[PDB]
Amino acid sequence: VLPNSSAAKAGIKAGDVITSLNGKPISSFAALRAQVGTMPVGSKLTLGLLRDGKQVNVNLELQQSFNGIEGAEMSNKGKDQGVVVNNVKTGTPAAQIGLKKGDVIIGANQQAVKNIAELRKVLDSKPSVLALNIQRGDSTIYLLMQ
Amino acid sequence: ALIQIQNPKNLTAIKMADSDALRVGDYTVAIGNPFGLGETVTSGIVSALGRSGLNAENYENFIQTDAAINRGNAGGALVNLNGELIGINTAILAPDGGNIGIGFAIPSNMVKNLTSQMVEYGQVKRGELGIMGTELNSELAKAMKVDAQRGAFVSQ
Amino acid sequence: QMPSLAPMLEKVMPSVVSINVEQKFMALGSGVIIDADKGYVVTNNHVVDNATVIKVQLSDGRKFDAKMVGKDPRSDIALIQIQNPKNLTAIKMADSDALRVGDYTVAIGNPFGLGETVTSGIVSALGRSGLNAENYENFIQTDAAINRGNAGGALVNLNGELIGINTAILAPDGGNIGIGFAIPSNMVKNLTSQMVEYGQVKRGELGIMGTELNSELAKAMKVDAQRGAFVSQVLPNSSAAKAGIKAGDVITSLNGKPISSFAALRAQVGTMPVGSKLTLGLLRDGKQVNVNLELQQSFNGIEGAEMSNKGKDQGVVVNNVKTGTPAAQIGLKKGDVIIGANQQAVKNIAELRKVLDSKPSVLALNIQRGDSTIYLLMQ
Amino acid sequence: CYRKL
Amino acid sequence: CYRKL
Amino acid sequence: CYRKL
Amino acid sequence: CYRKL
Amino acid sequence: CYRKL
């Protein structure tokens, strides 16, 4: 089972064996693979488990596979103190441009940025290039995209 | 590079000019030794200035010229119609090893600065201002509300 | 005091642009701003053919986007239009018919995308052709350095006036050997002016066949000139036929300008707009001949059938149908009389064309052939 | 080869 | 046999 | 691409 | 033998 | 690429 997965949250452990789905027995894994792959996200269902000859039932809710723009999770800072960067994922298009966790955006594209609302109003303009006036530490730097 | 002739007797030096006044359209005269044939002179003009990218790690401010330049022209002189040194012929753009009218020369003002350090110290004292940056395109000037479409953009 | 070209070049170079174009491929070439206000930039068709996106980088680096306007692959000339034109610089055009072999030339282009690169040369020759026999080619030849990317670039004289458009080179290895070719400005003048006014090129013909004049055929036909255009035959109903050109004539001049070859003369009028009134210099039986001519194409007739109205709102009688036309593919023997079509009565070509303007997917004609009433179907 | 014009 | 640019 | 001399 | 969810 | 001055 994968971490932060609904099944992990549900209580599914390795060595389990799935026997039924919402009451209906399952014909094959490749069938079940096709079954839930067609249900819309969040489909609350019930499963039939088998670990060590004991029937277990669990209810589940599908999972995916503050703002977040192009592989970077963000949130607000203070009272119009910019947009503080909580953390960055490395191999994503966000940190492939040199972004590191902790940076705080004061402005962008010569337009003042006080919160995330003034940011997405710059994304509503869709500039060919975005020039960010962030501050990491005691420095005033710029970072670009696209 | 700079070399020293042993027993210098009866030599002729070249007057170097201010390459920072060069303009696209000036007539150029190339001097070198293609294929060891001997001192060969060819004519051309200033195709462009500030050319770079043949080797991005190198400090290249090449002058482009249609003066004929082949293998062996390297280290040769590029002079104006008065014979004052404007650049040192360096490389060509030849997919076949024969000249097609694209030579590159390093401006004399760069050569004048680089030779003067080798005379006193034997190496180059590499100095730094301490800034990062990249090229300014027309797209970036729109975002930064900048008028000029070319130059140096200060990252930090 | 040193001579230099920087006075002419710093004035002209802003008028020449560099092009980036995007089995998908990405290419680059060059163009020259012709009309500063409308942002018209002419370039080679083989640079902007099969182009989905057209981006222009000016001399200063400013980027623009351009859209197709006209194209003529037979002459390898195309026109694009900069969108949102802001503070552009047009180029002055010269008349190339005054160029002389030995004049100094200047080549501006974007070789290998390195940027706007300027190279020098002279007029090697004029009217050269032969690399692609089906193309209208009357090239200017120059020893000015021209390589991949100079295509669509500018060839100017010493005064910065546009004389030709760098198009092609002759190279056994893909690298310049001192042989470059450019389309004379006057041809581009005629070629571009049609793209602005018509969006395509209205191609005219005189209705004559022929072949070039060699020294050996001049012997057999007792003709003085060793070079020109030999009249093989005149097609009937051609402007040349109506003008009185007969076979066996030898063309020596066009509007006074002597002729270099048949192939070069072919490229000239291949760019002139339809109806262009011109004067030719002929040679039949060793006698000088001049003729005025008017190019031609190569009631209301609809889709290869000549038709007109009959009587007083009695329909659209078909006057004639040529066998093998889209209107002879669906019978329509000469003499048909259309009373109606698609349950609507046809009194005239106007009530017909008002139904043609509807552009229906299928057309049922209520014509009458002979004393009988039939139907015919289209599309 | 006869050309047209 | 012959090429362009 | 680019060559030396 | 490896295939997601 | 990031270049230094």
Side-chain angles (χ1 to χ4, degrees), chain B residues 118-124 126-139:
Chain B
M118 305 175 175
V119 173
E120 291 186 358
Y121 315 111
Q123 68 168 18
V124 282
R126 191 85 61 201
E128 61 172 13
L129 291 81
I131 68 103
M132 310 291 299
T134 194
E135 301 280 3
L136 170 57
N137 49 33
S138 172
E139 306 168 343

Side-chain angles (χ1 to χ4, degrees), chain C residues 216-234:
Chain C
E216 299 174 357
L217 196 154
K219 288 170 56 69
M221 284 294 297
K222 320 233 168 59
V223 175
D224 266 342
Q226 263 70 26
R227 217 160 35 208
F230 173 73
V231 183
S232 175
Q233 49 173 315
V234 298

Side-chain angles (χ1 to χ4, degrees), chain C residues 206-210:
Chain C
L206 301 80
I208 67 97
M209 315 286 303

Side-chain angles (χ1 to χ4, degrees), chain C residues 248-276 278-298 301-305 307-311 313-321 323-328 330-333 335-370:
Chain C
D249 290 8
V250 171
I251 308 178
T252 62
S253 72
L254 166 52
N255 296 333
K257 281 305 168 201
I259 208 54
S260 80
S261 57
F262 185 107
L265 182 50
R266 192 180 169 257
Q268 305 274 19
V269 302
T271 68
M272 303 176 78
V274 185
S276 300
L278 49 92
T279 73
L280 289 175
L282 274 62
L283 206 65
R284 53 157 68 99
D285 306 332
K287 291 187 174 64
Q288 244 289 335
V289 186
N290 284 348
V291 67
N292 296 339
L293 258 180
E294 178 183 3
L295 293 192
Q296 304 175 338
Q297 180 202 331
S298 305
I302 305 297
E303 313 286 3
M307 313 165 295
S308 68
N309 301 318
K310 177 188 187 50
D313 282 7
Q314 307 294 285
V316 183
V317 56
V318 177
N319 315 134
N320 195 13
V321 199
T323 87
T325 61
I330 47 185
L332 276 157
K333 304 288 315 162
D336 295 346
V337 185
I338 302 171
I339 302 185
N342 294 21
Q343 285 299 82
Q344 291 184 33
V346 168
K347 320 170 182 306
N348 43 52
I349 302 188
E351 294 198 348
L352 152 64
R353 188 132 60 186
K354 202 68 179 182
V355 180
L356 295 184
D357 289 350
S358 180
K359 283 187 176 295
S361 60
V362 62
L363 182 56
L365 304 180
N366 190 17
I367 86 176
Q368 48 181 356
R369 164 131 90 80

